[PDB]
A paper describes a structure:
More specifically, plant PPOs are expressed as pro‐enzymes (55–65 kDa) consisting of an enzymatically active (40–45 kDa) and a C‐terminal domain (15–19 kDa). The C‐terminal domain plays a significant role in the regulation of the enzyme activity inside the cell by shielding the catalytic pocket of the active centre, and in addition it provides an indispensable motif for the accurate folding of the active domain. Herein, we investigated the activation of PPO1 from Malus domestica (MdPPO1) and present a novel activation mode for plant PPOs driven by self‐cleavage, which is independent of external proteases or any other harsh conditions (e.g., SDS).
To corroborate this result, an orthogonal experiment was performed, where the sole C‐terminal domain was recombinantly overexpressed (Csole‐domain) and crystallized. In summary, we have recombinantly produced and successfully crystallized the pro‐form of MdPPO1 and two versions of its C‐terminal domain, one obtained after self‐cleavage (Ccleaved) and the other one as an independently expressed domain (Csole). Structural analysis of the separated C‐terminal domains, Ccleaved and Csole, revealed a metal‐binding site. The bound metal was identified as Ca2+ based on the composition of the used expression media and buffers, the interacting amino acids, the binding geometry, and the presence of anomalous signal. Moreover, pro‐MdPPO1 was incubated with different amounts of Csole‐domain to investigate whether the C‐terminal domain plays a role in the self‐cleavage process.
Numbering used by the authors: 369 to 502
Write the structure that this text describes.
């Protein structure tokens, strides 16, 4: 299912994808800040600590056909091992993934946005938001 950016926060009960804008400086010049890593930030990841959580993150070129064959590229994963905490039932955390090499490999360096796919593997988890920044 394709989800708008304003649909977050969301419960990640199934695989979803969303269009994420690259940083604003890239709109003017696609090689702006070329010696800095371009970082995908998944914010507000929230779940019960006693629930094992895993989801995988993929990226694809925004111009690919969603009704066409999968051209998604693995970017990273979020994992939590079940545990208890002396004063918290839940964890609220973040995942940051480097995109610079990935965008070159998928040949999306000229694009202003990308598609991010989140693939739940186990555990109930909320995703607060997604952005790309330096
Ligand atoms: Ca493209
Ligand atoms: Cl926390």
């Amino acid at each position: 299912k394709v989800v708008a950016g304003t649909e977050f926060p969301i419960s990640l009960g199934s695989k979803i994808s969303t269009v994420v804008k690259r940083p604003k400086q890239k709109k003017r010049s696609k090689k702006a800040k070329e010696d800095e890593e371009e970082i995908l930030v998944i914010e507000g990841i929230e779940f019960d600590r006693d629930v094992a959580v895993k989801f995988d993150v993929y990226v694809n070129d925004v111009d690919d056909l969603p009704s066409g064959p999968d051209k998604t590229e693995f970017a990273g994963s979020f994992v939590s091992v079940p545990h208890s905490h002396k004063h918290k039932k839940k964890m609220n955390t973040i995942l940051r993934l480097g995109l610079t090499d990935l965008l070159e490999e998928i040949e999306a360096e000229d694009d202003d946005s990308v598609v991010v796919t989140l693939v739940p593997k186990f555990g109930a988890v909320k995703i607060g938001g997604i952005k790309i920044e330096f």
